[PDB]
Amino acid sequence: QDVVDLDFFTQEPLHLVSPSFLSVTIDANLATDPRFLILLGSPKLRTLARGLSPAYLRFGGTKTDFLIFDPKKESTFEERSYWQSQVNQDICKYGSIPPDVEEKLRLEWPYQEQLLLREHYQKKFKNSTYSRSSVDVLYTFANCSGLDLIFGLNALLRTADLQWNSSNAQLLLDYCSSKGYNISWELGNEPNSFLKKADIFINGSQLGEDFIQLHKLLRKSTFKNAKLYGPDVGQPRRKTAKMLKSFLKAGGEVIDSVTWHHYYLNGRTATREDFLNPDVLDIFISSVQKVFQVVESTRPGKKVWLGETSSAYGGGAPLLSDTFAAGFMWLDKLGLSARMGIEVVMRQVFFGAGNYHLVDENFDPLPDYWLSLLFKKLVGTKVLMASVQGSKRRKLRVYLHCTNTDNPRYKEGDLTLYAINLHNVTKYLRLPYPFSNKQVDKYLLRPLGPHGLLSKSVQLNGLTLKMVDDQTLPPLMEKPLRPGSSLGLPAFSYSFFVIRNAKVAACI
Numbered sequence: 063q064d065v066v067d068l069d070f071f072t073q074e075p076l077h078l079v080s081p082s083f084l085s086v087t088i089d090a091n092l093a094t095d096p097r098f099l100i101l102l103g104s105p106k107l108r109t110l111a112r113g114l115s116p117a118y119l120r121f122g123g124t125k126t127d128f129l130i131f132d133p134k135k136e137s138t139f140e141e142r143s144y145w146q147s148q149v150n151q152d153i154c155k156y157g158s159i160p161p162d163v164e165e166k167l168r169l170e171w172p173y174q175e176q177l178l179l180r181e182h183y184q185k186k187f188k189n190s191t192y193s194r195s196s197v198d199v200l201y202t203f204a205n206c207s208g209l210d211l212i213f214g215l216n217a218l219l220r221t222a223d224l225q226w227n228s229s230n231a232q233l234l235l236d237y238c239s240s241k242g243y244n245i246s247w248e249l250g251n252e253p254n255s256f257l258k259k260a261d262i263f264i265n266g267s268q269l270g271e272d273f274i275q276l277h278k279l280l281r282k283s284t285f286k287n288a289k290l291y292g293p294d295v296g297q298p299r300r301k302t303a304k305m306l307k308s309f310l311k312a313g314g315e316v317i318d319s320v321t322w323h324h325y326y327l328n329g330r331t332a333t334r335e336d337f338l339n340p341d342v343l344d345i346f347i348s349s350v351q352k353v354f355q356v357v358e359s360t361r362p363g364k365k366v367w368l369g370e371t372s373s374a375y376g377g378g379a380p381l382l383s384d385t386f387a388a389g390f391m392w393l394d395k396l397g398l399s400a401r402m403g404i405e406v407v408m409r410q411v412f413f414g415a416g417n418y419h420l421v422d423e424n425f426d427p428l429p430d431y432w433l434s435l436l437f438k439k440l441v442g443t444k445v446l447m448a449s450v451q452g453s454k455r456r457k458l459r460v461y462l463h464c465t466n467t468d469n470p471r472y473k474e475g476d477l478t479l480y481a482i483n484l485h486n487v488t489k490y491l492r493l494p495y496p497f498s499n500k501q502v503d504k505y506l507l508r509p510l511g512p513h514g515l516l517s518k519s520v521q522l523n524g525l526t527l528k529m530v531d532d533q534t535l536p537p538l539m540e541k542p543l544r545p546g547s548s549l550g551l552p553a554f555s556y557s558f559f560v561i562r563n564a565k566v567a568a569c570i
């Protein structure tokens with residue numbers, strides 16, 4: 063019997079996630095050579111980013127601590143040409159990249175991506191500077207896409223006696239004020255590895271004092287209520303958890319959320335079997351619990367965010383992080399993050415170097431994009447609970463929220479269920495009373511073509527998902543089911559199910 067009874071716990075929300083729960087990053091290394099930020103002027107990338115609104119866009123990464131704002135930095139032919147074409151034009155409606163500039167940057171980009179990835183793996187970072195125009199590219203991309211920019215400041219600018227030197231930050235904050243920019247801030251990226259990356263050790267008490275310093279600058283700015291997030295530590299291995307604890311004790315008062323990072327695997331060694339292994343999926347739960355321990359003992363009730371996360375570190379697992387098979391880790395991470403109290407999850411990366419990107423080198427969406435878009439359209443902020451009967455929940459993983467209220471097909475009280483089947487056979491889910499004779503809309507994702515799970519193309523209810531054109535996402539078409547029918551989930555797949563007229567009081 064491959065028929066599994068669901069239990070639903072709908073009486074009240076377990077947690078409330080932000081409307082921006084599914085958020086994204088742009089790696090700070092896109093600014094190593096700032097010409098490549100102009101790729102963010104693509105109308106195709108804008109269309110795709112808009113599909114994920116509301117969301118935060120976090121500009122950060124290892125390079126956050128090797129970037130220096132220079133208000134007099136010279137621009138390049140690419141940058142000068144891009145900005146010259148936007149003059150006297152509504153950039154959000156009509157902005158594009160000049161075709162010569164677009165062609166050149168796209169020819170150079172695969173070399174650049176190799177450089178960025180190898181620089182990362184060798185841990186040989188140099189300081190580089192970025193201009194006012196670079197800031198403007200990031201700001202307008204985010205603003206035109208309906209995203210909220212979070213900008214990571216360089217925490218390795220240091221005085222003689224090991225204190226953060228805030229003078230470059232001040233330059234930047236003043237520039238942003240003078241343009242009317244609504245930006246939230248971070249300081250430093252993965253401070254736990256500063257010793258390896260820069261042979262400077264900054265401990266968490268000191269980093270907290272640095273955050274205190276920054277908060278004081280933000281209070282004196284024209285944007286007095288700008289938000290401040292930190293400390294963007296790596297996942298909570300012993301020394302990292304100790305550093306998080308000391309940081310929160312010293313600087314925990316001035317941060318609006320606690321940010322940490324997670325990757326399941328080393329991209330160099332990850333296997334196909336690891337991507338489908340529920341034991342790999344389950345280790346994320348240990349990371350989450352350790353984080354909440356540190357936070358509850360120092361700043362209880364403080365919001366906890368995943369500030370940078372994906373399948374595999376080192377730029378992603380080649381031939382795996384950009385596939386349908388990467389969806390199991392991504393959907394499960396969202397499911398668990400919601401159910402365990404994480405308020406925002408920031409996906410490394412929307413676009414950029416690596417293959418854990420949502421959108422590729424030709425600005426085409428990967429399967430994880432489509433998964434993210436369907437999640438955004440269907441899943442609401444109120445987290446409920448589901449479970450499967452029989453204590454084999456490892457391979458059939460289920461999550462339940464109120465249906466997204468912004469969705470015009472659905473109404474107050476409707477439920478969105480989502481489910482992952484990691485068995486090698488089809489499973490059938492039976493809804494419990496009082497949801498057992500309802501109209502249900504199915505949204506089943508399956509990979510397209512001969513590579514099966516390793517495909518980079520995906521179908522929704524048997525229709526290939528593809529952008530209509532550069533300005534247009536497709537409709538995501540439900541498959542209505544017979545009332546009372548069980549919910550069928552093929553081997554190695556994932557699906558959403560919207561329970562219509564469910565009338566759940568908690569979702570109203």
Ligand SMILES: *[C@@H]1O[C@H](CO)[C@@H](O[C@@H]2O[C@H](CO)[C@@H](O[C@@H]3O[C@H](CO)[C@@H](O)[C@H](O)[C@@H]3O)[C@H](O)[C@H]2NC(C)=O)[C@H](O)[C@H]1NC(C)=O
Pocket residue numbers: 223224265266267268
């Ligand atoms: C976290 O990092 C800070 C460094 O920013 C450490 O603070 C420093 O700690 C040492 C104590 O071992 C201080 O050295 C002492 O200085 C006094 C003079 O002020 C001198 O009388 C002592 O003989 C000794 O040399 C140093 O001043 C201090 N710096 C600051 C700015 O406070 C801190 O100890 C570290 N904490 C942990 C738990 O690792």
Ligand SMILES: *[C@@H]1O[C@H](CO[C@@H]2O[C@@H](C)[C@@H](O)[C@@H](O)[C@@H]2O)[C@@H](O)[C@H](O)[C@H]1NC(C)=O
Pocket residue numbers: 485486487
């Ligand atoms: C499939 O997985 C097996 C273990 O899973 C169990 O058996 C399968 C057929 C389903 O009934 C599932 O619900 C069970 O949890 C492995 O031992 C077996 O080697 C695998 N079979 C194939 C054909 O790959």
Ligand SMILES: *[C@@H]1O[C@H](CO)[C@@H](O)[C@H](O)[C@H]1NC(C)=O
Pocket residue numbers: 187188189218219220260
């Ligand atoms: C980067 O520049 C800052 C100040 O401009 C300096 O303190 C730091 O040591 C430099 N680091 C590297 C790795 O070049």
Ligand SMILES: *[C@@H]1O[C@H](CO)[C@@H](O)[C@H](O)[C@H]1NC(C)=O
Pocket residue numbers: 220221222227228229230
């Ligand atoms: C901070 O950095 C600025 C700009 O590089 C430098 O001129 C200044 O001396 C530094 N301040 C301290 C307190 O070290």
